[PDB]
RNA sequence: AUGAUGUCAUACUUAUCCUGUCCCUUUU
């Protein structure tokens, strides 16, 4: 009749990160920082480049299913609303000198999908730094995708 | 007007006036409110009211138009309701 | 401040014809309302005798416009020179005049200009 | 008065509350506004003078320190037989001053 | 019933609240029958005054003083 | 704006007041300043309206000073007109140094 | 009158540290020799392991328990939570004070009288 | 962040409530919505056209650029990520901009734009449009230079008929609503709303609502007189417009979702029921409480009668009971707000219940104690409060019981947290046991260890209210259970670290001290006192009077068993004479200052010796705040010791005194001229005629003071050494000032002049003066004529000689060279007619008012209050007949302005005298309907 | 992280009487989907425009980049429209409509 | 030759006034 817990309430976690109309996962780490390198997002569903995304202008990047919570719409019934997170970090590296220092590269890593991803045909799994590059042939979509991104 | 003379709510009763301003506030006002009840309560409830204070009062609450018609209604069943040796208006002798 | 009031515009002209023109300190203790450089300023810009305040005429337009493209700025230098010498009036007439008016490859290019 | 030509004096009833005056506003009087001849004291409403409105200044409003008097010219004058000369209203007076 | 007539208040001023003092637009008729009520009551308040217009009369104090009283309202017709 | 216009009266305050000495005209500089911090937003106005409108001067004052081997004389200057003339020459040092347009020849700036 | 009191608990912290306290006088001479500060005006939807993990910021508490009330949850909006030393529960007393936690903000104050199961306000 | 939801107010009856109803039926449907499932919420045409105001067009451009804007949603994703950037090339080089254009205009602050844009515009010159561009003068009352504010403001006061409240509040409201607004400016506004409010009467009717939403927000506030103000001008308001007109008006406000206006309305009614009276507004009232419908609304018109208890106050009493008949019903309800609101407005009512109506509370009581008994929460301290407030109008014998049961639970209930519990159990503490019928054991066992324990605390003292309610309660124990328990029980504490806690208790010390006396006080404990009180005293945070007033009141009170201490008082008084410059050498001083008299009466000279040259000593000190402390010091010191016997002889003294009224600064010219004043009037022999008359021409510009107690003491000594040489000499310095500043005081030398003629008999003085007034320069001229008027103020009765000498200058004054001369001469006449009553002299008082008569008309206020006065003064002297027959043919002649004025007269002539008038009413002929002859004075025996 | 004072309507000024809604939808644009905007067509309004936005964050990076923005050689006045004033011009109704859909179509 | 409204300085009077604050708004 009473059993209090003490437990982890999900209302502390809800108002630090707090969206429009729905609750805000896959936080940035504090060693986010803006690019500066030449990378352009060159999405190719049909071999034809018609859009075109700055991901170095924005700090956060949302595409789902829906409208509410996205800014913009997706066309990919077969991907969920939180399916990858693309967000660029300088992460803790070592360059081709051999000096340490703060260099500005994306980070990959899974965010619990229901039927995972594959990238350049291959699966990949979370928490493992891996060298994302440009040009690299991923997929947007849980199980399959018919657009690449570059 | 018709608000000259002098009546005295100490002869009449109370209960049997509660639907004719209910249906006349209904009437005016549109829709059933809480303060014009209360108003025309308070201006019954002493042994000798004023015609013209009410009339006021009245005509502050609603337009004034509808207003003199209510006070003109109600004068006059107070009237009949006074002059009677009963003590009731013309509309409770037959219902 | 300096709002140069008709009553206090008499009273520095008569502090000048009495006392005199080059003691500025003598006549700002007889007005309590302005300093002795404000008072010398007004002495010499609306309260001096030689100034023409009025009869505009097209002969000082002409001078005046034919001295604002020899020099731009400086307009207190061509004071003087105009014969307005108020300092302020060249100035309105300058601007009633604008007013009232108104209502490497590049040689190569050239060079070719002429020759086609 | 003199200080304050918009004010409003109260002249309520007379009751058996003995007015008081300020230290600020000590020897003035209510009617004639003067400061020599006094003859007769002040006398309060009964709600002029009840809980924090007691032991408070006619003229002035603020703590009353002496009892305040009426002056005799006001007094010979029958300026004195009038109602309680509270001041209730303030206008114009000690306003655009907090500002500053 | 419309009267379109609230003499209440303006901003609290003039408001008169005593009797016999009267106005500038006071006409002739009030001002008499408020100086002859003053001198009614000023014929009621002093006793030598009493005295010396009921010795003349035939009359008592107290009938007199009842007289007074009755010719207080109507002791000249309200003009 | 703001920001460049209080870094400037503040120069023209520590400058023309450092420690209790007076005139009249520097009285009336000293309340000019004071005014221009007390409704700083009115003053900015009063600034950008002498700049764009009064193309003339009042009359400037000059006398030496005697450094005694080479004398160096030393001008000044009537106050509102110093005030608004000081914040444009803080504006101007301020989009000059954002610009970059003076070139690293003439050095006489910030290092030391 | 139900949330005035983390206004004047404020009020007296802001006249405190305007008035030139000492950190003698600093109204913890009255609280002291207590480590149990009472925490009331709590969201209903508040578990005791969320307020035992936001309030772990000033040291590791030794003692807490939700008030329980209505027999389904034991919840009431109250709550009573011993912390180490009196310096953490000072420095709880004189920052967590009429913060905002989760929509409706709670109150922070020291009680240092006893251990009781209803002693705050609803 | 409560009361920011007055930014969400828009501005401004069966539609009104068709609203409302509308409004809370859409706060089901969102609301249920999430259930089912804010400014941001889309809007539709009709809701754009409703924000914008008139004139303006929403034609787009071409039918490829909106199709761009509904793909930027999408495209503000997508064309963010895409190839984009900014950049310029350097090359050579129209200009436009509006400041305020007008004459002068002063300035425009950056946003203030959006309202007096419409100004910005040049266009000029070709109806209503021309009233609101004109109507921009509000912007001369925000924003300009002072004169300019008050030019304004009076020219839109006289505009107010003209342009009607309809463009004004229009034009303001706004304003008053603007976020970014000031404080001066709120009040500017607020200021100018009143002065058109007090002609506008009929024309607000519309507009009473749409103004309230904006003022009410000024009844809560933080700064009290923005409240007093607010209050006023609801007043003002709702006087103004019609009670019908409120009421009809307000109802919806009393059902509105947020709580807010909700309260801050009920407050409003409260103000218009004490403008309008409590039993013309009775029945609305009591068909609130009744209202079936919510309970929302009978919550608000509880609060309503709280409201009104705490505004009427004292004034409550006649409708009490018939309020409290009112008021009962809720204390049974099933809601609990209701019940809690309720029995706190009866507390209200009966804190304002003076000392009487009990039974009025009658039915109240039976409940509310059951209720004692089965509460938890707020609402039982509530009852608290009501019960305590009640308990004093209680009949001992049945509050004997009564109280002895409320006791327990007040005992019980000491421990809460809550300190709205303590507030209210702390002053129900107060009156329970400050009742009469209580006996001190029970108090002293059961009471005073808990109230100690728990209430004694760092907690309480920093607040405010805890603070003085605390002081209350602790001194009206002391008042029973006796004082030496009470102070032997916290003189431990002066010695506490903090400040704010010594300062509480200090001031609790210096109270009961103050009441019950010191005798009741021990040996001991008298030891534990005094070095407590120098102990808190010897260091001092900040400057302030409750240590100091602490101490001294210990100490007269104490009185000569203070005698053993003092030489430790006085050790600590010149060390600390020394050690903190600007801070506690004032502060030092004043303690001396108080002590003197106990310094005194003991008979301890060689410290009279020690105070009086070592205070000597410091007059040379250059900071005034100190200075002036000791200034003050030395003058309580001259108040016990004697002329003859002052240790520094006044030869010394006074000289040295001289030189220091330079000062200017009241703090040191205050307590200056104060002492100057005490010896210059009580030895004064001591001091050479040379050093006095020095001191006059030192004395002469101390008039400037810019205080008027300063202009006070300066005159009174100026009579004080007129007195120690004779007239002539110093009057005639009077006289060596033309009044040439107006600033300061000026008059005041007229003043001397008066005082001066007192001190020796004006009886030598006045031919000197009169013939003064033959100087051409005309403000000295009006002087001397108000040195006449204060002059027979003064002398009252001995003016039955002098009246004949000031007759004809009077003549020749009263007879107008400038209005100025008519009105103070009338002055004179006022004074000298009340002076000289009685006496026989009126003959030459009616020559006089022959002259003053012709003066009547004008529209000048201070001549026509002048003469007002005059006329009143000449009433009394010459007796109502004579005036009378000046009066009567005034009455009916056919202007309006000599009907106006004679009226106004006849009506001064009228109240006072009323008695006398009956023999003078001449012989008036009967008409045809009415008898105007009086025939009883001509009955003839 | 707003000041509260700040609303979706902002008030624009400082505008030609030839200009160009082409323009004005272009430039402002940018920060969000416009709601709506009107223009003073009336001899005192003329020159000034009222812009109101889907969002106010929207006009937020508004103000914060056209501050001062400059159009032709004018520099446009942008300030945050106040709210109230005048209002009452419109009324309040029509609720009743709407509110019985919302209590018909989801039933609620 | 008065008088009229009118933008705009200038003198004069009120013995005008310079430490005023939330000691009370505590509204969900």
């Known amino acids: 009749k009473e059993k209090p817990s003490f437990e982890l309430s999900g209302a502390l976690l809800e108002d630090t990160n707090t969206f429009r109309g729905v609750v805000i996962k896959y936080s940035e780490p504090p060693e986010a920082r803006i690019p500066k390198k030449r990378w352009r997002l060159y999405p190719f569903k049909n071999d034809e480049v018609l859009p075109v995304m700055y991901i170095h202008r924005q700090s956060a990047y949302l595409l789902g299913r829906h409208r509410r919570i996205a800014d913009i719409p997706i066309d990919h019934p077969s991907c969920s609303k939180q399916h990858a997170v693309f967000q660029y970090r300088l992460v803790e590296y070592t360059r081709a000198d051999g000096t340490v220092g703060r260099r500005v590269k994306p980070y990959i890593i899974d965010l619990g999908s229901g039927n995972g991803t594959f990238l350049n045909n291959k699966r990949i799994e979370p928490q493992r730094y891996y060298e994302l590059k440009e040009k690299d042939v991923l997929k947007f979509g849980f199980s399959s995708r018919e657009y690449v991104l570059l | 007007e018709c608000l000259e003379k002098k009546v005295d709510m100490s002869k009449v009763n109370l209960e049997v006036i509660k639907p004719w301003i209910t249906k006349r506030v209904t009437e005016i006002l549109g829709f059933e409110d809480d303060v014009v009840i209360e108003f025309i309560f308070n201006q019954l409830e002493v042994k000798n009211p004023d015609s013209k204070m009410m009339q006021i009062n009245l005509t502050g609450f609603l337009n004034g138009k509808n207003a003199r018609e209510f006070m003109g209604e109600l004068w006059p069943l107070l009237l009949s309701a006074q002059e009677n040796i009963a003590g009731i208006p013309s509309a409770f002798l037959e219902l | 401040g300096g709002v140069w009031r008709n009553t206090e515009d008499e009273i520095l002209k008569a502090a000048v014809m009495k006392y005199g023109k080059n003691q500025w300190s003598r006549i700002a203790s007889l007005l309590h309302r302005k300093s002795a450089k404000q008072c010398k300023a007004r002495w010499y810009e609306w309260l001096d005798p030689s100034i023409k305040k009025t009869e505009w005429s097209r002969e000082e337009e002409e001078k005046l416009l034919h001295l604002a493209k020899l020099m731009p700025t400086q307009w207190r230098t061509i004071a003087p020179i105009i014969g307005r010498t108020a300092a302020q009036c060249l100035e309105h007439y300058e601007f009633l005049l604008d007013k009232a008016a108104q209502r490497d490859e590049l040689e190569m290019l050239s060079e070719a200009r002429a020759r086609l | 008065a003199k200080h304050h030509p918009d004010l409003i004096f109260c002249r309520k009833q007379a009751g058996v509350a003995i007015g008081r005056l300020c230290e600020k506003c000590d020897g003035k009087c209510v009617i004639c506004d003067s400061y020599v001849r006094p003859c007769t004291l002040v006398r309060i409403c009964d709600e002029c003078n009840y809980g924090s409105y007691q032991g408070r200044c006619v003229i002035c409003g603020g703590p009353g320190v002496s009892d305040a008097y009426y002056c005799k010219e006001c007094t010979i004058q029958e300026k004195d037989r009038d109602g309680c000369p509270k001041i209730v209203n303030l206008g114009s007076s000690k306003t655009d001053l907090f500002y500053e | 019933m419309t009267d379109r007539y609230t003499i209440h208040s303006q901003l609290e001023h003039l408001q008169s609240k005593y009797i016999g003092t009267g106005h500038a637009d006071t006409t002739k008729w009030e001002w008499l029958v408020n100086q002859h009520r003053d001198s009614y009551c000023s014929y009621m308040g002093h006793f030598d005054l009493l005295n010396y217009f009921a010795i003349a009369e035939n009359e008592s104090k107290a009938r007199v003083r009842f007289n007074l009283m009755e010719k207080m309202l109507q002791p000249c017709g309200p003009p | 704006d703001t920001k460049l216009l209080i870094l400037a009266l503040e120069r023209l305050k520590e400058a023309y007041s450092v420690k209790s000495r007076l005139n009249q005209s520097q009285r009336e500089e000293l309340g000019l300043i004071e005014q221009a911090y007390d409704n700083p937003h009115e003053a900015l106005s009063r600034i950008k309206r002498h700049l764009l409108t009064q193309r003339a001067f009042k009359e400037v004052g000059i006398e030496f000073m005697d450094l005694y081997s080479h004398l160096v004389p030393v001008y000044d200057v009537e106050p509102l007109e110093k005030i608004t003339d000081a914040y444009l020459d803080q504006y101007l040092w301020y989009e000059a140094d954002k610009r970059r347009l003076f070139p690293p020849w003439i050095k006489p700036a910030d290092t030391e | 009158n139900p949330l005035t009191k983390v206004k004047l608990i404020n009020e007296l912290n802001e006249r405190e540290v305007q008035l030139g306290v000492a950190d003698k006088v600093s109204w913890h001479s009255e609280y002291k020799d207590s480590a149990w500060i009472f925490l009331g005006g709590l969201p209903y939807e508040l578990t005791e392991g969320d307020i035992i993990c936001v309030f772990s910021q000033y040291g590791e508490i030794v003692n807490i328990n939700l008030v329980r009330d209505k027999k389904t949850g034991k919840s009431k909006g109250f709550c009573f939570l011993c912390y180490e030393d009196q310096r953490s529960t000072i420095l709880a007393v004189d920052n967590f004070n009429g913060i905002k936690i989760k929509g409706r903000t709670i109150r922070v104050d020291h009680v240092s009288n006893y251990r009781a199961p209803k002693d705050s306000e609803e | 962040e409560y009361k920011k939801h007055r930014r969400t107010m828009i501005i401004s009856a069966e539609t009104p409530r068709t609203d409302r109803g509308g409004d809370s039926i859409g706060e089901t449907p969102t609301p249920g919505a999430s259930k089912r499932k804010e400014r941001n919420r889309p809007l539709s045409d009709e809701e754009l056209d409703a924000m914008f105001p008139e004139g303006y067009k929403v034609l787009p451009p071409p039918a490829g650029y909106v199709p761009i804007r509904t793909p930027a949603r999408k495209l503000t994703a997508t064309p963010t990520p895409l190839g984009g950037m900014t950049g310029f090339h350097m090359q050579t080089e129209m200009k436009s901009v509006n400041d305020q254009p007008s004459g002068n205009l002063p300035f425009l602050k950056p946003d ?114 923005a409240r007093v103000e607010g209050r006023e001008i609801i007043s003002n308001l709702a006087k103004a417009a019609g009670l019908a007109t409120m009421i009809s008006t307000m109802r919806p406000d009393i059902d509105n979702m947020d709580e807010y206006v909700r309260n801050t309305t009920a407050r409003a009614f409260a103000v218009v029921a004490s403008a309008l009276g409590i039993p013309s507004l009775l029945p609305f009232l009591k068909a609130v409480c009744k209202s079936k419908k919510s309970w929302q609304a009978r919550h608000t018109g509880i609060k309503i009668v709280q409201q009104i208890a705490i505004l009427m106050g004292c004034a409550i009493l006649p409708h009490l009971r018939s309020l409290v008949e009112i008021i009962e019903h809720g204390l049974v309800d099933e809601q609990q707000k209701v019940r809690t609101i309720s029995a706190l407005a009866i507390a209200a009512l009966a804190e304002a219940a003076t000392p009487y109506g009990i039974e009025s509370f009658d039915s109240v009581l039976k409940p509310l104690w059951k209720g004692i008994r089965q509460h938890r929460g707020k609402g039982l301290a509530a009852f608290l409060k009501a019960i305590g407030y009640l308990i004093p109008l209680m009949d001992a014998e049945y509050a004997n019981y009564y109280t002895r049961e409320v006791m327990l639970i007040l005992i019980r209930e000491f421990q809460s947290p809550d300190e709205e519990m303590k507030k209210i159990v702390l002053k129900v503490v107060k009156q329970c046991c400050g009742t009469d019928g209580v006996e001190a054991n029970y108090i002293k066992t059961e009471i005073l260890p808990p109230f100690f324990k728990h209430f004694w605390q760092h907690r309480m003292a920093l607040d405010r209210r805890n603070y003085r309610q605390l002081v209350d309660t602790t001194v009206e124990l002391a008042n029973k259970v006796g004082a030496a328990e009470i102070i032997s029980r916290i003189v431990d504490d002066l010695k506490d670290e903090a400040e704010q806690y010594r300062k509480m208790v200090m001031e609790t010390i210096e109270k009961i001290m103050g009441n019950l006396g010191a005798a009741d006080i021990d040996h001991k404990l008298e030891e534990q006192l005094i070095d407590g009180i120098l102990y808190a005293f010897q260091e001092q945070t900040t400057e302030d009077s409750v240590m100091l007033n602490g101490f001294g009141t ?297 002259y003053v008569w012709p003066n009547v008309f004008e529209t000048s206020p201070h001549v026509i209050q002048a003469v007002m006065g005059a006329l009143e003064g000449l009433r009394v002297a010459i007796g109502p007949c004579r005036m009378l027959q000046y009066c009567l043919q005034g009455l009916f002649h056919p202007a309006r302005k000599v009907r106006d004025v004679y009226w106004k007269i006849y009506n001064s002539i009228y109240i006072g005298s009323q008695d006398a008038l009956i023999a003078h009413y001449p012989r008036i002929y009967n008409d045809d309907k009415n008898t105007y002859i009086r025939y009883e004075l001509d009955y003839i025996l | 992280r707003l000041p509260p004072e700040v609303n979706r309507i902002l008030y624009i000024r400082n505008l030609p009487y030839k200009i160009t809604a082409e323009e004005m939808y272009d430039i402002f644009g940018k920060y969000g989907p416009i709601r709506q905007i009107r223009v003073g067509n009336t001899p005192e309004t003329r020159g000034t425009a009222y812009v109101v936005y889907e969002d106010i964050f929207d006009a937020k990076n508004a103000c914060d980049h056209l501050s001062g923005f400059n159009v032709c050689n004018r520099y446009l006045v942008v300030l945050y429209y106040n709210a109230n004033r005048a209002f009452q011009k419109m009324d309040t109704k029509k609720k009743e409509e709407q509110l019985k859909l919302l209590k018909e179509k989801y039933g609620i």
């Open chain 8, 112 to 225: 203030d734009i959006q309202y007096f844009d419409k100004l910005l515009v040049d266009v000029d010159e070709s109806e209503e449009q021309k009233e609101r561009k004109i109507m921009k003068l509000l912007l001369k009352i925000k924003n300009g230079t002072p004169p300019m504010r008050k030019a304004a403001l009076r020219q839109i006061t006289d505009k107010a008929r003209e342009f009607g409240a309809g463009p004004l509040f229009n034009q303001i409201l706004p304003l008053l609503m603007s976020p970014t607004l000031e404080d001066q400016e709120r009040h500017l506004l607020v200021k100018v709303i009143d002065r058109i409010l007090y002609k506008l009467d009929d024309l607000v009717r519309p507009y009473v609502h749409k103004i309230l939403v904006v003022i009410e927000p000024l009844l809560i506030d933080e700064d009290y007189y």
């Open chain 8, 554 to 850: 210990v100490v007269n009170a104490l009185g000569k068993r203070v005698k053993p201490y003092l030489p430790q008082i006085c050790g600590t008084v010149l060390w600390r004479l020394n050690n903190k410059s600007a801070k506690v050498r004032q502060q030092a001083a004043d303690l001396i200052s108080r002590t003197a008299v106990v310094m005194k009466t003991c008979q301890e000279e060689k410290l009279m010796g020690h105070l009086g040259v070592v205070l000597y000593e410091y007059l040379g000190e250059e900071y005034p705040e100190v200075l002036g402390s000791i200034l003050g010091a030395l003058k309580a010191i001259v108040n016990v010791i004697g002329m003859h016997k002052m240790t520094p002889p006044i030869k010394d003294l006074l000289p040295r005194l001289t030189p220091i009224l330079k000062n200017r600064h009241e703090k040191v010219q205050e307590n200056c001229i104060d002492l100057v004043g005490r010896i210059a009037d009580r030895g004064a022999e001591y001091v050479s005629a040379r050093e006095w008359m020095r001191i006059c021409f030192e004395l002469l510009e101390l008039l400037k003071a810019h205080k008027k107690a300063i202009r006070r003491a300066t005159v009174n000594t100026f009579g004080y050494i007129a007195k120690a040489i004779g007239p002539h000499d110093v009057l005639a310095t009077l006289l060596n000032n033309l009044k040439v500043q107006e600033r300061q005081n000026r008059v005041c030398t007229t003043v001397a002049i008066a005082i001066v003629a007192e001190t020796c008999s004006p009886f030598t003085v006045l031919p000197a003066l009169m013939n003064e007034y033959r100087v051409p320069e005309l403000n000295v001229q009006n002087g001397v004529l108000k040195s006449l008027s204060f002059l027979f103020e003064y002398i009252g009765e001995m003016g039955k000689d002098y009246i004949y000498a000031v007759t004809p200058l009077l003549e020749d004054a009263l007879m107008d060279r400038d209005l100025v001369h008519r009105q103070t001469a009338s002055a004179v006449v006022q004074h000298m007619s009340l002076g000289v009553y009685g006496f026989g002299c009126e003959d030459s008082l009616n020559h006089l008012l022959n």
